[PDB]
Structure formats: structure tokens, C-alpha cells
Design goal:
The structure is cut from a larger assembly and holds two copies of chain A (307 residues) and two copies of chain C.
Chain A lengths: L9 E3 L2 H4 L1 H4 L7 E6 L3 E3 L5 E7 L2 E3 L4 E3 L1 E2 L6 E3 L5 E2 L4 E6 L3 E3 L5 E7 L2 E2 L5 E3 L4 E2 L6 E3 L5 E2 L4 E6 L4 E2 L5 E7 L2 E2 L5 E2 L12 E3 L9 E8 L4 E3 L3 E5 L2 E3 L4 E3 L14 E3 L11 E6 L3 E4 L3 E5 L2 E2 L4 E4 L1
Antiparallel strand pairs in A: 1-2, 2-4, 3-6, 4-5, 7-9, 8-10, 10-12, 11-14, 12-13, 15-17, 16-18, 18-20, 19-22, 20-21, 23-24, 24-26, 25-28, 26-27, 29-30, 30-32, 31-34, 32-33
Chain C lengths: L21 E3 L15 E5 L7 H5 L10 E4 L3 E8 L9 E7 L11 E4 L1 E2 L8 E8 L2 E7 L7 E11 L2 E4 L8 E4 L14 H9 L2 E8 L2 E8 L7 H11 L10 H12 L8 E3 L18 H10 L3 E4 L1 H15 L3 E9 L8 E6 L15 E11 L10 E11 L4 E8 H6 L8 H9 L1 E7 L5 E7 L6 E5 L6 E3 L1 H4 L6 H12 L18 E7 L8 E9 L5 E12 L5 E14 L4 E8 L1 H4 L8 E10 L5 E9 L6 E5 L8 E8 L6 E10 L3 E11 L4 E8 L5 E10 L4 E11 L4
Parallel strand pairs in C: 3-12, 7-8, 15-16, 18-22
Antiparallel strand pairs in C: 1-11, 2-4, 4-9, 5-6, 5-10, 8-9, 10-11, 10-12, 13-14, 17-19, 17-24, 19-20, 20-21, 22-23, 24-25, 26-27, 27-30, 28-29, 28-31, 31-32, 33-34, 34-37, 35-36, 35-38, 38-39
Helix pairs in contact in C: 3-5, 4-6
The chains are: A mainly beta (307), C mainly beta (722).
Chain lengths: 307, 307, 722, 523
Amino acid sequence: PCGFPHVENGRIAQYYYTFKSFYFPMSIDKKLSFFCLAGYTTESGRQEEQTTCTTEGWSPEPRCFKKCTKPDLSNGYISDVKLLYKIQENMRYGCASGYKTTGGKDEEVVQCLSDGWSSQPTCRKEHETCLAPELYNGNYSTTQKTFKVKDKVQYECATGYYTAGGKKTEEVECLTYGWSLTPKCTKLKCSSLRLIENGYFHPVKQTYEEGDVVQFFCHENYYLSGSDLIQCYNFGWYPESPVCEGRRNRCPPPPLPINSKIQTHSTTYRHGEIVHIECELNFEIHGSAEIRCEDGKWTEPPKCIEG
Amino acid sequence: PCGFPHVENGRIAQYYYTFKSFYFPMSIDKKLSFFCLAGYTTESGRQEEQTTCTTEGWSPEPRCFKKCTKPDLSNGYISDVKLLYKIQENMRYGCASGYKTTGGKDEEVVQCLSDGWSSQPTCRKEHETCLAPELYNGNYSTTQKTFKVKDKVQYECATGYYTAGGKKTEEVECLTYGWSLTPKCTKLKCSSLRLIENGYFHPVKQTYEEGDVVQFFCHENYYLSGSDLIQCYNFGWYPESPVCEGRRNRCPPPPLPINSKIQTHSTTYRHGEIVHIECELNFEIHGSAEIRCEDGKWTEPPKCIEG
Amino acid sequence: FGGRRAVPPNNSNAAEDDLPTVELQGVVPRGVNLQEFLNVTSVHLFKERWDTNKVDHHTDKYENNKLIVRRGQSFYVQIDFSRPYDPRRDLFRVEYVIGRYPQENKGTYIPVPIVSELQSGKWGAKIVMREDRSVRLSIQSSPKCIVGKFRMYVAVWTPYGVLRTSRNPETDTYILFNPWCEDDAVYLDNEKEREEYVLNDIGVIFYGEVNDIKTRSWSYGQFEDGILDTCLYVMDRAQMDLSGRGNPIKVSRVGSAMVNAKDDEGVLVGSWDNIYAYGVPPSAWTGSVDILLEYRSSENPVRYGQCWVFAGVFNTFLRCLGIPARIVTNYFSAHDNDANLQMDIFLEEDGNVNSKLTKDSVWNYHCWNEAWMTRPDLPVGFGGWQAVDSTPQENSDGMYRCGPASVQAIKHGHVCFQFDAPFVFAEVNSDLIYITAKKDGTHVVENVDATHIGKLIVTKQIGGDGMMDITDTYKFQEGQEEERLALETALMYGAKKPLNTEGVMKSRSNVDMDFEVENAVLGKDFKLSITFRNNSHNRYTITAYLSANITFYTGVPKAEFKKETFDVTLEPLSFKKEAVLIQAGEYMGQLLEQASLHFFVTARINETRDVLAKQKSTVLTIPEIIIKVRGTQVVGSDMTVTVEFTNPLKETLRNVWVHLDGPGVTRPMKKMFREIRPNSTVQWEEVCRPWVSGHRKLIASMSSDSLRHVYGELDVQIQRRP
Amino acid sequence: IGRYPQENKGTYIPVPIVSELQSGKWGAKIVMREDRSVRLSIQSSPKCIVGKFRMYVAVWTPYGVLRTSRNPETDTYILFNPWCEDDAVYLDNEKEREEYVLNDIGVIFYGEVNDIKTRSWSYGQFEDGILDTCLYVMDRAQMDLSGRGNPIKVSRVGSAMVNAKDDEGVLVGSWDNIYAYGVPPSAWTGSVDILLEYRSSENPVRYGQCWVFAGVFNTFLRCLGIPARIVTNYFSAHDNDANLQMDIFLEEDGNVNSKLTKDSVWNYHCWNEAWMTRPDLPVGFGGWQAVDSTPQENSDGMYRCGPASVQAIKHGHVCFQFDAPFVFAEVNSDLIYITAKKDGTHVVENVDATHIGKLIVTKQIGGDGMMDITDTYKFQEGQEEERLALETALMYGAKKPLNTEGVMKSRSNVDMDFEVENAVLGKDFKLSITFRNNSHNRYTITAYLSANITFYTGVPKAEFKKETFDVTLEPLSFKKEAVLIQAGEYMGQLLEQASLHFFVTARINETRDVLAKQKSTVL
């Protein structure tokens, strides 16, 4: 049956906080109303909504999303008197004279999403000539750095590197807001993250590059696998990819006895994983030199004692 | 300054949850009123108290302890009529004729201590010849299991276990109510985890057994510096407790490149810390030997080719 | 001049204004051919009781010939013009208007736009058909609409301003609350509960005491001719702002305050004086119908009411406007508690009851209403049943009605929420305290009983006349931890315990005491038996006392009719039983209405100083009135009703009134008999012409200069007319 | 105390003799003995009933109790105690006790927010017979003596007595400007003669208005010993019915529609604040409670509002008792400007959140200057915390009937404002209208001035001047219109408090946008 929900930024009916042990765990097809605090809203853009108990727990899921704030917009204007916006509503902004938006137009529309606005509201100054940017791991087709309205620049990347469109060699057009696509060389871009189940992540975006740290989480009655923080190097994601599970039995970092060392710190220590402990100079080991993780518990470690 | 107080089994004045970003963190010597839910109390036995922001954080901490319940005793009676007992409040129970209390008396007064009763209330039977109780992870020094009044028996615990008085060997005397102390083999308990600001940990106890594990969590826009999990052992808690701070100020562990070792392994790494990678004997480096934790990222690690 | 307000308050539905039949716009020319614009020739509301408008709104029961609809749901009308309507050239709208100072932003002038589709939650009209000169509309009202009798107009726009229909009283439309509509604040998702708590017009009221639950019927009669207009008149006499009458909370908060009359304001003068000079005795009423029509026709407070009469009249008011509602009876009610969870009984040093100081009382039963609504003024999860006690009690705002208090708030002890929740919580959750008032003037708490108050709470079952126990909807199982959590939560938010029960404990002796009183018919001797039982190896001597009192049902005593003393010795592990005979001649000269008796048994154990104390009530059984019927039970046919009553006393009853009632079968009728000799019987016969089919009930009552609170009923099946 | 005293109801109080006085309990300590005589240090409970108690001394014997006869020289008044840490009205600062309890001369703020006016008011809570009159007000309320120990209930019941509906109240409210068969509300110098006239005539006094009710209720609270002050709110949205929107209606051409515009904003309004803890609420809501003795439609009916916690109102936490949604709406309503079209549709043209409750003031501690307390009632405007409070109020039953969701800023980039110079009654004065064009477009504008004589409640009596302007703004420019208002236009027509109200409204011909502004002034 369904447990007591952990409503972040929100509440269920106030008596359930006191009478928890009477009401929970709760039988299937019970309906439970919840609401978000001011400044927050449910997945549907409501202030108040119902979840229902199911064999898989609560559904729909009790989450409250922060309203997106009006931007401190550089070189621009907005249509609205509003300070705060609903999740998955949208807002219109535009340019001062001689300026162009983040999307290169005179005006742009942005959607409020889980991590903020769908694109950052900003107006760039508007001009005629483009400059070719610094091209790490590539070379340009010409010595010329300056390009006029609707001129084009062609460029080629280093051995095993790829252009901003993922070709080996590429060409792009100068426009009065800047380049149509920016000239850049990289390794093959970090993969569009595999959507997990029973959990979620922050820094949510469609594609990633060297750095670009992402943090993962599980929802109630589930426990994460892999690290919470992941980041791609130019060769790929590290650690490889996280997963959610409601039965995780993984240990904390290996316990270290005073006057001791261990052979390597792993990124993980699951049920059945082992660590070997070595005592430091003038000390000898008491108990087993190997220790094991089981049921998310380390076996209690050895001691180091003087020779 | 003091961050948002996570009150346990209780609340602060309820606008502070909505206006969190206005009010917090608070200045030192500022005072804040908090309260317990029904069935819980502050350590003084009050339903409500003022905490104060200090250089030590919120002092006293906003923790509400559970009320002790009326005991399930037999061969006797409870003088007090009430079902639930305040922390630091006391209660009286007494025996039928031919029975004696857990303290060996005709009547006993017990206090609901800072968590739980000062003794388990029970009315036992006059032990003409006491019976030695069960002793898991220990041995009595004799094959005898029954002994006369004013006879004595001595016992010793297994490796990594301690007697009911905290020694490793202990002796008890038979009396007309049972043993002068009850034989048991036990383990040392880790100290109480204090309430953090801006977050929480889910498995809550007054003290923790060896092999108990605690998971920490933070409220949104705060992050847990340090480990996700911590474990108790007879030597104490292994890591320091993690903290819900701002930003990230923490990187996931790097890979070790093939044919290489590092100058310092660690449980966790933080912003500005260096991992320095050294190639093994008969191998030669390419890329930087230094990598640094920066905004949660790392610089790409080196390679170690054959010499 | 008048500087308080820019226009006077729009607070009477009976009041009207004259909307112009023409409003000119701009400099209108001489001799404009206005006949090129539409003119309304007739309006049809399809208002017949067999037709879809009243049938789909569940408003076909009301004995009223005008249109009645429930808010938030659509209904049909047809408009007939001077020529065909031509959307290319014709703008027009329906207007609904209420009170003397109607304003659009106040919701009291309502222009209904012609639209392509009816939007959810908006006023609008869809053209569903056109044929020749006639347009048929489906009109939707807002689910937050004001409740009351709207005037209706049809208005045509022109380049020269507005042309409008003249005042036509045939078109006035009652808009009511809508339990069937998912968007209404009063929405109730269950069919059988809507049938019971809205469409049933015959109630059952539970009385007596918890070991002998008596029952009577009550005609709510919310569909009877002129009752709906009387419910609008009650709100006009409250001077309630019409813009506030869209809210079921405020209609319940205000309507309950109108029921009990303080001064010459309100529906019923309260009296408990047992004499009832210059008025009708509260135990004589068969239903709300004649009270409300007497109020509407006299314009003055009706004499007299008591808690179940206030609850009956308020239940008619709520069900008539369409708020789902029921009466509930609480047994052993701690009324006039002032949020104190303690009722005190005082004892002399020897353990006898000190009658001089014992002035708190526990009502054998008490009645209040529950109204069903959502609570948008409170946090999530406090909707559903709201307790409203229309009986005056000393309160946060002096002496007044309590509620709407959320029943869901009361059960969990969340008495921080409005309205009056600490006072309602204390009706059901108080404790008895027994106090020795020592001769030195000190007070010692000897014993406590947390179990006595609110021992049962009941209401009529859905679709039948049995009791339904609802005690668990008001409080958790007694002695369990959840009762303690509810109590502690109430103490956080202004419930009170004046005396700290810390210096009180289990008896030293381990002696139990209990007693039984057998039920009796009025004018018979009966047995009361007391038992004392020893759970110890000690020997005890006990002096015990019986005090027997005649009381009003409010527990207020009038006389101690019997007093006795017993000395008991209990051997180790033994028990003893004392049998007491109570004789008819000890009580028969002295009984109050409802014939209620109250017994205290108390004792002090000599060897341990412990006090034993228990109290119980009985209500004497009085024979029912017998009702019989003759001739055909068919709607519109004449039916003969015989009401018979036999005097149960050994005295001549005088100025005896018999009343007869039964909604849809007969109007309220009453008959006067000058005297009724001791063993004698009377008959009364009427010819009545029933006007409602299906199952119906006849209800009767009797009252006099001595005996009253006597009832009878008959279920009559009435066949449909040919 | 009273005719039917009972010990468990706290109205009979036997004081036990004790070796030490406990905290929070009735008792008496024998501190000295001297021949025939005993000296007692007596202590009363911090939860004691407030009122005038009879005193007796009673001696116990084996045969009965021997008691002193009735001695009216020993009758003892027991009052609320702002100096005692255990009292529900405890105030933790001595200058604040000295002002809010022991000061008997108040200052009342009136006029308009650009030209604030002050007058003194004698509270006189110490004067001969005023304490007995405060007890008489509760006796005429028929308030149970066991309820007079509670400062919330004494505030809740005492405030309901201040304005009389039929008989049974202290003052008859009137705003008719005629005041036949009574005293004009603007004549009174203080509470003292009102209260003694009520006490002696035993019937409602003629006549009162918001500051008179607040003056009398401030005397009542300070006399019983509850700490209290008057506060004035400028531009108060009174009679709001918990709606956060006041409607102004405009004709299609942009003129004000005076036929439909019936919402009125009071130039100022007065209510009381009373200081107490709130054990009926969860933690965090003690201190100043707003009580308004001026009746409006609230959840009970046409009644006084409060005590509403001011700390609840600041956070929009209006689910708590009493009447908090109606008090919140007075300080937080918007103006909405609506075109009432000739086709009978309504269109929202413009919105102004800045006008209502622009400033809230009270007398300063130790002087006659004003103290701004606006930030105690609401957060800084245009910041996130104002929106958090508004959303919290909309969760707990405040209302916005019209969805302004479709409203946007004027794409014309024109802006307009006007000024009225301060003047002496019977002098001519100048009104200046300014326009600015922040765009490379040329525009043409038709603008209207409507000047009205009004009561201070904003209710108008006549339009004393009206004028129209046709204006060009050439691209990225600015233009100014000026008006001279003369004494012969208004002087034959003024109401009490000499208040004028100006609407300036304009429609931009090319963009169809409406610009609307309004300002009061007081001669």
C-alpha cells in the first residue's frame, strides 16, 4: 500500500502530519488532495490537485515546481506586468533599437520549464560584420577573420574532431545578429541523456559538452545507483549513467582505520564488493585485511597495531 | 548567519516556509519560536520554545522527542491514569504479592528520559533459585543455568561485543527478584546526529547501532556537501556529517587512467582541490598530470602510454 | 447627501426597480423606424413540472408555478420576435436581475451573451434552434451564481441604444444551490445521499437517553407552497447582501443566526420554562412548515422553540435553498461549555452529592445540523460536513450559534479554524470531574470520567428510518492514542482544562461499582439495582448513597424525588447487590416534559478514603398516538384520516391540543379537546385530499396543560392519479 | 464578581494563605504580624477576569464560616497587565507601554497622502467615571464575566458595541453632512464626553464616523489596560467584500462613466490595533491585531472586522479568525479601469496596483510626528514577497473576479501624469497635466479632466469642473496642459473635510490605448 508522501514545496491535508501512523500506509483507490505553497504550482499549473493510491504508489506524482521569475533583461523590453509565471506557460520579450534577442529576432517567446526559462532572455547589440571565433581543435579555410552581411565562413576540424553540426568540415553564414550557426570544433557531443524511471535530474537540456555537470535524484521508496553528480569529458559521460531503484543496498565510502591505506577508491561499492586494507609503517593488521559491502553495510573494519 | 531550521516532529511559524528566501539566513542573537506536533515535546517537556541563532547554529536545536506510552505490564498495576507521558515526566507502577518490579522493589517510579523509559516496567516473580537469561554473542563461565539466592555467576562476550555494564567480562548475583544486574551482550552506539539547516536525514534515532546507516537529503536550491550515506561502527561514525550548503562545492570522483596511480585518494573532493595522476613504471604521460575540481567539473585526465 | 456609500446596500430580494423599456444612446433622430430592430412578442420557459427543465434540475417537487433551476447547469427557453432573428443584423441578450440596486460587478445584474458554445463555469446562452420568428436558447448559469428569485428581461441592441421587455412576473426565475453539479461548492458525488439530504422532506429526530433511544418524525416540508419564498424572506429579514447569497458558508452562518430570536429579530423565541404561556409548547410541533408560514405571515418571532425545533427549522431552510443538510443528535452533550473540556460534580466530605454547588449539567441529548459544503476559506481537506448549532451558547462572540465548524477539523482537534470549533469540540470531548468540596473550603479531585460525554452521536439512515451511528465521524475510538492526539491538538488551539488532573489516580481498594435501572412505562413502579465488587484480599466497609432527581432533558434538576443510604461490607474477593424499588407515587405528581429521571450513586470506602461515583438517566415510556386511514389512497381523491389518543395518566388532561401533519398529504391541522377523563380515549377525523404520490407519512402530536411530548405516525402509500 | 458567582467559573475566588506565592496562581503570603493585625502580600492569577470585584474576609470555625459584611470602600478593580511576563497582553518594552497604555492624548491623521493633516484627540482613559463606563459597555453588551479575562474576546465584544445598530451601542454612525438632532462627528475633541454621555443617557450618542469610533475604542482598550493605537490607512478599499479589485468604468471615447462608477476609495480610513498573544492560532501570530469598529459586510454580516493578526495580514495568511480577508483587501486591492462599450461588453483597459493603501501611519512613541508602519501591513511593492502574500491570500478565500491575465503594457510608449498644487480654502489653484512620448512615432491624444467634490470616503456629490484637450505628441517628445481652478467654481459646494477628486483620462487615437490617472486633494 501507499506510504506517507514527501511533498517538497507543498502539503497534504494538515491532520495527516499528526495522524500519520493511523492513516498510512493507505489502501488502493484512496484519493489524497495536495497543494503547493505560494510561488509554486503542480505539474498541471494548478495550486491544488489530487493524487490516487495505486500498487506502484501515488499517481499522479506529488511534485511542486517553482514559478519562473521575470528576467533582469539586458537591452530589451517585456509585454507583461507579471513577476512570476506558471510551469509550462510562456512569456514574450523584445529588443532596444540596434539590438537582437538570444534567438536573433527583434522579439522572442520563452517557456517556463523545470530548471528555468527555455532560453535565457537577453538582447545582443545588432551590427553588420561577424568575426570568426577562436577554433580550438580546427582550422579556417581563409586568413580572413571579418565577414560582411551574408558572407560565409568554412572550417575543418582536427583528426577525429567534428564541427558544430557534427561534420568533419562545415560552412556557415554571417547575419546582423551574428553567425547562423557558430563556427566550433569538438569531439562528438555528449549523448542526449537516457530518461530514467522513478527518478529525475537537474541541468536538463537536449545536448551536453565537456563539463556540463548533471545531478540525479530518486523519488520516495527508491534509491539512486551511480553517483548523483555526473559530468561528461570530451570522450563521454563519467560515471557512465545513473539508474533508480527502490532496493538499493550500496555502502557509504570505505571506512579507513587510523595508520592505514587502501588499494584504490572506486566510484561505487555495491552488495558483494570488497576493499583491501594495508597498515602504514611500524603497524600490523588485526582482524581481516579485506572488508566487504553487504545490504548497504560495510563489515566492521580491522585495526592497525604497533609492531 | 543561521540557515532554515529543519524542525523535527514539529514546525516554526508557518509563514517562514513560504517567505523562506526573505527571512533566512537569520542574524546571530535573533530568536525564533517553534512547536511540537501532538504526541511530541521539546526536551524541557514544553510543547513550544524559543530557539536562538548562535555561532553554533540554532541553539537549543529545534528537536521534538516522542512521548513515552503507557507500558504493557502484568502481575501488577500503574497508579497513573494517562496513556502518554511527557519527556522528563515520571510514572508509578507496583506489584501483586509474590512479584517484584524491574528494579526489584514493591513499587517503582520510572521517568520518561530524553528518549524512552528509565527502566522497562514489569512485575516479575520471586526467584527462589534464579534462572540465567539467554546470552547471544556471549558465554557464562559455567555450564549451570539455575542458581540459589546469594549465589553468583560470571559471563564474557564474544569478539566485538560488550557486557550489559560495558566491560567484556561481568558478574551478577541472584536475589529474591532476579539477578542484581541482567546479563546481556551488546555493542557500542554512535552519538546523536544533530539537526542540520536547509535539509534532513531520514532514519532518526537517539543513538545508532554498529552497522546502522543514515542517508542525508536537502531542500531545493541547497546541496549536500560531503557523503550521501554515513555508517556507524563501535569506533563511532566514520565520516563527518554532510551539510546542506549553497551551490555545489563538490565533484564526483575521477577515473584512474590505465597504467596510472594518484597522489591522494579521497572519500569526496571539493572546489579548488587537485587530483594528481602519475604513470606506472615503464609508462610515459600525455595530457596534464594535474586535474582540479572546478564548479563541479574536472579537467580531462591524462594518458599513460608504454615507455 | 449620503457619504457612507455611493449607492444603498442591495440586501432585499423582495425589493425591485423599474428598468427602462427603452434606453436612448447618442442624439436619437425624430421618428426612428424602431420596428426594423427586433421586438420580443413572447418568452417561454418550459416551466411545467413534467418537463425537462424542472425534471433535469430536480426542482419538480416544489409546489410553485414559476421556473426553478439549480446554478451551474443549463436550461432551455424560447423567445418569439416580431420578425426572424438575423445574426448578421441582430444583437440581443437575456438579462437576469436581482434586488433594488443591481450592479454587474456585484453579480446582481447579469447580462447573458449569445455564444457559439457554452464555456465551462461562465454565464452564456447558445442558440440551439431557429424556426420562423422563434429562437430557442440553451442558457447556462455560473456555478458561483447568487441564490434567489431573479427577474428576467430580454434586451435588443440598436444604433440608437437598447430596447427591452416590460416587467413580466411570469418570467421570474429562482436559481438555487446545485448538489448535482461538480463545480458547485455544495456538490455531493453520491446519488442516494443527494436523494436523502436534499430531496427527502420527512425527517426523523432521535431523543430520550442512550440506553433507550426514542424517535419521532418531523415534516421538513421544504417543497410545500410558500416555504421557498419564506427562506428568501428570512435572508431579507437578516438584511443579507444579495451578492453574499452565492456562498453556502455565509447562507449557513447567517441563516442559523436568524433561527433563534433574541428580541423581535429571528424565527423562534427559545423557551425551556415548562409553562409556555402565550405560545405553542416546543414539544407540540409536527414540522417546520407551520412555524415558517406563521413567521412569514405574522412577520414576528414564533413562540416557542427548543434545540430540535431550531434544528428542524434550519434543516428546512438549508434543504429548501439546496444546501444538503441533516439533523444529528449527540447523547450526553456538554452544552454551555465555554471551550472547557471539564464538567464539575461536587461532593460533600462523606461522599454524598453536594446539590448546592453542582450547577453544571449534561444534556441527556442535544440536536444540531450538519450542512455539506467545500470550505475555500480553510486549508485543503476540511470540506464535507460542517456542524452548525443554531442553539445559542456562550461563544467567542458572546451568546450565539456555533459554526459552520468543519466536522473533519473537530475530529482531529484542529480547532484553530473558523467558526466556533472549540465550543463544538467540547460538546463531544469533555470529561466529568468529581470534586470533594471539603468543609475547610478546599476542592479535591476525587474521580474523573472521560467516557460519559458524547457517548453516541446519531442521524437518520439514508433511505430508511433506523438510526445511523456517526460517533466515529466526530471522534476516534475511546481510550486509543488517536483520541489523545486529537485532545492535545485541541489544547494547542484554545480548548481548555481549568483543573490539572495530576493529583488523581486508580483506586487504592480495587473495588468496582456499577448499577442498572430497568426501563419503565409512565405510572409504573420499577427496580434500580446497585452492585459492588471486590478485586482484593482485603475486607472493606462502604457507605453508599442514592440521589434520584426529576430533570429537564438539559439535565437541569427540579426535585430530588427519592434519597436512600446503604452500608455494605465486602469480604475478600466477594460482591454484593442492593435492590431498590422506585414507586410511581414517588415521581408521578412531579414529572417535567419528556419525563426524564437522573440517578447519582456515590460511596466512600472507609479503609482507603477512595470515592466511588456513577450517574445514569432514564426516560419514562409514554404510549404512542394511533393514526388510521379509510377510503382510497389516490392523489386528488378524498381520504379519511382518524387520529386516536388514550390518556395514560391517573388524572384528567385539560386543554388538550392534537396536531396532524404530513407533507404532500395534508396541511398542518390542529384540534382542541377541553378535557380527557383518566382512562378515556378521544378520536378526531378529517377528510384530506393528498397531492403527492408514492410513499408518504402522516405525523401527529399531543400537548396539554400537564402531559406533552407525545407522538405518532403512519406510513401511507399514495397511488398516482388516473 | 457579579450576582451569580461560581468558583469553577473564576467569579468566586477564595485566596489561599501560603508560605510562598507560586508563579501563575492566586495566593496570599503573611509577610508581617503586629498585635491584632496581619499584613498579606496578595497575588492574582495572570489569567484573572478584568472588572470590579467585591472583597470579603472569611474565618473558619468547627460550626461554620464567619465573614465581613458588605463594605463598598474595599471594592477592587483588577485590570490587564502589560508589565507582567505571564499576561496575554505583555508588552516587552517600557517606552511602548508608556505610549500605548499610559498616554491619554492621541493624534489622528487625516487629509490625503500628499498633504497629511493632524489633529489631537483626548482618549482620557483615566478621567472620572471612564473606567466604570468601560465596565458598563461590557454590561450593556451582556458579556459573561468569565469571558472578561480574555483580551481577544474583550476586543471582539467591545468593538461590536462601538457602532449602534438600532439601540444598544455607543455611537450612531452618520455621513449625511446634515447631522440633525445630534452632534456632528467632526466636532468631537475626545472620547470622554461621548462615553460619559452614553453612560448617563443610557442610549446611543449621535453621531460618529471612523476616527470617532476608533477614538472611543482606543479609550476602551487603554482604560481596561490592553495596549492600543489608532492607525490611518491612505486610499483604503473599504466595503471590499474580500475582492482585491475596485472598478472604474470608462465611456468608449475614454471619458469616465459616472453612471456605472460606484466603487469608491476612501482618501483615508482609521482602525485600531490592539496588542495581545493569540493562543487560538498557531505560533507566529501574536502582537498587533487589527480591529475595525466601522461596520462593513464580512462573513458574519454587516459588522466590525477583527481582531485580525497584522502578522497574518502581512503574509496573506487570511484563513485565521477573525475577518482577515476583508482587512487584507483594504490594503491590497487594485484599481481596474473598464471600458463599458455601447454594445454592452466590458473591456479591461488599464490596471493600477499602486494606489490602494499607499501609506499606513500612526503617532510616534514620545512625540506628535507620524510613524510610517506600511511595511508592518505589506511587503515592499513590485517585489516577489508582495506576490507570495497575494497568492497566499487567494488560496484562503480572497477573490479576483476579473482575470487581468490578458492585460499588457501600452506598446505606444506614451506616458501621462498630472499634479495639483496645495491650496487654502477659497483660493484659486493650478492643475498641470504632463505627457511624454518615448517613441519615434507621432501621436494624437484626446484627454479629459473631470473634477469632483467628494466626501473623504470618495463618494462624489457634484462635478464642479470638466474640460477636454486635443494634443499632439511629436515623435520622442513631451507636452503639458495646464488648468486654473478658481474659488467661485468650488466654494458654494464643498462638503466637510473640503475634499476634491480629479480624474484625468485619455485615449491615444492611433494605438487605441487608454491612459488613466486620479488624485485627491484637500483644501
